[PDB]
Design a protein around this nucleic acid. Sequence first.
DNA 1: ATCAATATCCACCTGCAGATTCTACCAAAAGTGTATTTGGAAACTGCTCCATCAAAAGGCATGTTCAGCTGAATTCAGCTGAACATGCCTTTTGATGGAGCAGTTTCCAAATACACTTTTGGTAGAATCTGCAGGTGGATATTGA
DNA 2: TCAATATCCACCTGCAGATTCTACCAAAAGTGTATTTGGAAACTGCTCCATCAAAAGGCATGTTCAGCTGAATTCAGCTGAACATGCCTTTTGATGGAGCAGTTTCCAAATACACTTTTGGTAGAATCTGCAGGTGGATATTGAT
Lengths: 93, 94, 84, 78, 99, 97, 108, 104
Amino acid sequence: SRKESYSIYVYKVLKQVHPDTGISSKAMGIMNSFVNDIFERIAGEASRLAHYNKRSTITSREIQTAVRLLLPGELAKHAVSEGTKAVTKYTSA
Amino acid sequence: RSRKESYSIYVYKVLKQVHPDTGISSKAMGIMNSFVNDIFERIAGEASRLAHYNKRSTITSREIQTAVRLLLPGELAKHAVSEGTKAVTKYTSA
Amino acid sequence: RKVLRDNIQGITKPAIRRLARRGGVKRISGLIYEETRGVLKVFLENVIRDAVTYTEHAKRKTVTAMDVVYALKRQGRTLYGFGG
Amino acid sequence: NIQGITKPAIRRLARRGGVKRISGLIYEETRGVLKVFLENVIRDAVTYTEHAKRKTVTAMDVVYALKRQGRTLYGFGG
Amino acid sequence: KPHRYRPGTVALREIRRYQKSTELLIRKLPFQRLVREIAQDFKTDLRFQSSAVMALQEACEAYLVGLFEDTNLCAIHAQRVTIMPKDIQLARRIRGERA
Amino acid sequence: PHRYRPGTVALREIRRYQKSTELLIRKLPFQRLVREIAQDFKTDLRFQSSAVMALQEACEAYLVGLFEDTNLCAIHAQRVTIMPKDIQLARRIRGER
Amino acid sequence: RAKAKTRSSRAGLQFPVGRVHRLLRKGNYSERVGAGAPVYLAAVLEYLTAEILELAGNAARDNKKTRIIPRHLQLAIRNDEELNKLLGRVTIAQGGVLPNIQAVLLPK
Amino acid sequence: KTRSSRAGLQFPVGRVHRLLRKGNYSERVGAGAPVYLAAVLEYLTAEILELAGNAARDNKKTRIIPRHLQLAIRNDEELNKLLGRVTIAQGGVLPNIQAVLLPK
DNA sequence: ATCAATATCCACCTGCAGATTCTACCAAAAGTGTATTTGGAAACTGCTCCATCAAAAGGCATGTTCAGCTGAATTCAGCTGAACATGCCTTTTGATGGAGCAGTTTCCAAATACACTTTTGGTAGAATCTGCAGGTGGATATTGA
DNA sequence: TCAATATCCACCTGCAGATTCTACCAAAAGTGTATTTGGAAACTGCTCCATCAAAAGGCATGTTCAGCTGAATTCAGCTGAACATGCCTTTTGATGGAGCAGTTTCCAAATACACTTTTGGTAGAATCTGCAGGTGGATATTGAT
Ligand SMILES: [Cl-]
Ligand SMILES: [Cl-]
Ligand SMILES: [Cl-]
Ligand SMILES: [Cl-]
Ligand SMILES: [Mn+2]
Ligand SMILES: [Mn+2]
Ligand SMILES: [Mn+2]
Ligand SMILES: [Mn+2]
Ligand SMILES: [Mn+2]
Ligand SMILES: [Mn+2]
Ligand SMILES: [Mn+2]
Ligand SMILES: [Mn+2]
Ligand SMILES: [Mn+2]
């Protein structure tokens, strides 16, 4: 049947930063694990945030506070900018 | 008017059952409430994961049971499982 | 309001000795007191930082005991006795 | 079976661990720790197996086990 | 005489005394100023429920006491009875609190 | 008639093993230990080969991590040789004991 | 119309089955929640609070008190291997620690 | 006309949205949440690939393998902290020998 | 082996802070009747998991030195505990003003629910390459003398 | 230092296990078209959170003094490291067969909705009442001699 993964997306991102670099299958597995793990942590924290505040919906606001709580310093700053940038560019054109 | 629930009433009933003569300070009751809420979260959380890994959308007594075996050590698990099972078979006996 | 400075020195040599005692410590080097303050400081900043983040997310100006409880839970430092 | 985990293999692990000199007693001590570690993870994995009514332990069962034992492992489905 | 207990005797009496009780060991007002100072450096204009400050003190003290037990095991392991900064560092290292 | 001094080869191996990533425990013996332990929890089990590999990866990374903390404990006692008491102390501080 | 029976009494429990059922549905644990789940969970929770109240009540007795306080809860948790493991990363406010002095520290 | 191209991302906003709704995180999911989350996941991914790529280049190789992901992560303070309790299978460890153990 | 200096240890009191019952009012469990949906049975299908050899091939198990590390013994210099005198500043009580948490009440964006339409991944092949694993040769790093 | 024994480090080379690159085609993901409903404003009750004021004694701060603990130094066993030497489990590969993880439809049983009706629980409001101190003689405990 079908088993979906982030492979095609990790790969497209690989070409942006290193057009000439490839990646082994095992390393791709590592990246998939990574995306899934970080996805769960952010989502999990956003979930608690909304529950603590008695809110039924997870907005970009809960995702942002969750990122702030989970990522160490500089990573949080950049992650936060990358995220609000994508939300504005998506709410525009 | 503002009103909030807690497991205090039940903790107190259970306390009288095991120690009829013993009371409990409010600070101790506060700790018992954190405890119940905490274990509820660990069990429910583990049950949620279990159901999700098995593409099942419903949490049944079977999920609560596996979560219990994963979370509690040896004897505590055995006894908890027994009590839970006995309460379910009884509950369903109408 | 008055300026808050050097309050980490409010954690005295005797208070730290007491904590070591409860921790079972019999003899303490003269350098333990400054190390302890530094360690306490790092511990407190990390918990305060998370607690205040929950406070701001709720749009409050008051850090609640629950903000601190959630912050301690995040850091694998679950605390029983103050709600939640 | 645990004796199959040999002195030289344990030495290799220690070396990657940056260890220069090893005491004669470390070998049996190491086997005991490795056994507790395997028992705890496998017990958890099999519990996931049995819950899914399977007779085959999958990598995902192991991955979920390691995850709750606070030993998250990347590269096998998570 | 004057009477004098030998070094280590009072220390042991103190351990028995503090391991026997549960009251906070750090003065309350000083600890509250420390909390307010640290907090103020993160976000200005903050207020605190009094129980929030107490939750923090209970946590910091349980944390320091737990750390001293581990520090103590590191001193004994070096065949010492006196804890030193390097024992605290070794414990924090193994506890994964730092590299 | 040439011999390296004790420790010289030990250091060489550290350099070699810290440089590689291959599994250091023999595969078959490991698979055997795994199946045995598993049999005590549920009989007649099968294992995806990748299930056995994940277990060996996790288990070998754990022991390597443990040996580093054990080493720090031996050095703290001003020794250069790791002993059971070093592993015990590291596990106690980690909260595994 | 029909005799109102609590799910708790039907289950033979002191803990609240209805409440627990509600907490399950509203915690986003799953889309659906089976009827037996809240019964099984209320029982496990009740069993566990009975176990620690039994041990805490005894620590209270030993210290010659009739009222269980936090310290009593600590002594019961830390002196019991399984509860200690279950709550190994929890801190009980006002609980203090167990009396314990390393042998090497005593006078020879 | 996909949501990713609109948000200018390479990661799948549509899937992140679906994964959020079906993971039992909340009753409802805002439209911006999957966008934000997707961007965050993409950024972290680029950050690691960037450093692993370099680790590869410095090893005189063009294909990133696990070893490289390990070298990139353990040699970076923040990534190391974020993945402090994670093990990269086949990643091995950073070469490092305690001074006290050296000859002389 | 005996005290003398002090530090618990164990009962015996007794009026409060702080539990433990008391009542009302709901918020929210409990019925009933319906409309859906979940997820077990019984029946196959490829997958991929054990066995089974079947040899080699490292890799492990043994004794043989003996290098040098750990553990056992002193031996102090001076750190850090115990005891005291001083008097500072945390504690304990008591208001008080008012910042700011929670309530109720509206009420639009913004999200969910539903068919459709269109597009994007995942999958089973077909077409190459990044290095693994050797080679040979040239300085290195170690050691003994 | 010298001489030589093994270790590394290179630059180059060729096969081949993977990594890529192709060609479809059914599950998502994107549209449009109606509800639905959060959970922001908008006040606005009314908890607590700052902030003194004032007094009092529990404790923090310094200082003296010297016990005994943490270093330093010095060996002498012996325990581990380095090394051939010999053989035997582990590794490497195909079969070859079979247990068994997935789907495939059934649908009966269990759940998720809507009111509609009861109460078990949660606020304060009175009623108790464990003990937190407070004071004394046993009992020890320590440390000098
Ligand atoms: Cl030090
Ligand atoms: Cl030992
Ligand atoms: Cl059920
Ligand atoms: Cl949003
Ligand atoms: Mn400041
Ligand atoms: Mn106001
Ligand atoms: Mn396509
Ligand atoms: Mn090569
Ligand atoms: Mn509404
Ligand atoms: Mn003074
Ligand atoms: Mn002297
Ligand atoms: Mn000494
Ligand atoms: Mn008393």
